[PDB]
Amino acid sequence: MLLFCPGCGNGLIVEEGQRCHRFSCNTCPYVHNITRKVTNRKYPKLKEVDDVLGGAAAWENVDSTAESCPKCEHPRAYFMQLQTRSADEPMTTFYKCCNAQCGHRWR
C-alpha cells in the first residue's frame, strides 16, 4: 500500500535499519519503525461455481436430522453453502431436489 510522509508528502519506501525495518522518505529524514504486524489484504475474485457443482458432484454437507426439502417433503436433496466471490462475502445457501418424476432447482 502507498503510505506518504507527513512532512513532505513524497512516497515512502520500506528499508532496513539497525534495529527495525523502516518506512523511509527519499527526500527528508523522516522514518517510521515497523514495531508491530501490519497487513493489507487484496481479496481477489474467485472462479464461477455455477457449472462446477452441477451433475452429481462430490457434495458432503448433508448431516443426520437434516431438513427435508420444502416441496417434496423428503430428504432426497442436497444443500450446500459457499462463498460465490472472495471469503469476505457472507456465504449464500442453495439447494437442489432430485426425485422420481420430479426435477426442480431452488434457492
Alpha carbons 20 and 12: distance in angstroms, whole number = 16
Tell me whether residue 20 is annotated as binding.
Answer: no
Residue 94 CA to residue 107 CA, distance in Å, equals: 5
Q: Is 97 annotated as a binding residue?
A: no
Residue 76 CB, nearest distance to another protein (Å)? 21
19 binds another protein (CB under 8 A): no
50 phi and psi angles, rounded to 5 deg: -60, -55
| The three cell numbers locating residue 93 | 445457501
Which residue type, as a one-letter code, is found at position 25? C
Stretch that binds Zn ion, among 21-29, 32-40, 52-60, 85-93 (CB under 5 A): 21-29
63 binds another protein (CB under 8 A): no
**Among Zn ion, another protein, none, residue 85 binds (CB under 5-8 Å by kind):** none
Annotated binding site for Zn(2+): 5, 8, 25, 28, 69, 72, 98, 102
